[PDB]
A paper describes a structure:
Here we have solved the X-ray structure of the ACD dimer of human αB R120G close to physiological pH, as well as higher-resolution αB ACD wild-type controls. The sHsp wild-type ACD X-ray structures all have a deep groove that runs down the AP dimer interface. The groove is maintained through sequence changes, register shifts and across a wide pH range. The base of the groove is lined with four arginines, Arg120 and Arg116 on each of the β6 + 7 strands.
Small Hsps (sHsps) form large oligomeric assemblies with a high capacity for holding onto nonnative proteins that are handed over to the ATP-driven chaperone machines for refolding. sHsps are ubiquitous among the kingdoms of life and within mammalian genomes occur in large families with members differentially expressed in many tissues including muscle, brain and the eye lens. Small Hsp sequences have in common an “α-crystallin domain” (ACD) of around 90 amino acids, with most having a short conserved C-terminal extension bearing an I-X-I motif and a longer variable N-terminal extension. The ACD is an immunoglobulin-like beta sandwich comprising strands β2–β9, and the assembly unit is a dimer. The conserved arginine in human sHsps is on the β6 + 7 strand at the dimer interface, not far from the dyad axis.
Numbering used by the authors: 66 to 151
């Protein structure tokens, strides 16, 4: 989901509730945030399921890639954020 852009901040949210933190990987390639999620076959309420996604976000030009950080909430939302340099 969301791509919030403040004057002095940068923040993107992603609903990854089906993936455990160990099943997710975030990589910063230049000005691109890459999020990869993959989980092997798992039983759920409906049957059995495996999933995989690869999401790419464009970072604003005024954001130092080195300052990008991330976090996961209890509600399974992944947030990637960084300070704006201007």
């Amino acid at each position: 989901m969301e791509m919030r852009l403040e004057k002095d901040r940068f923040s993107v949210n992603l609903d990854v509730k089906h993936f455990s933190p160990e099943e997710l990987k975030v990589k910063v390639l230049g000005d691109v945030i890459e999020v990869h999620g993959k989980h092997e076959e798992r039983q759920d309420e409906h049957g059995f399921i495996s999933r995989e996604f690869h999401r790419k976000y464009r970072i604003p030009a005024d954001v130092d890639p080195l300052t990008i950080t991330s976090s996961m909430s209890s509600d399974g939302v992944l947030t990637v954020n960084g300070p704006r340099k201007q």
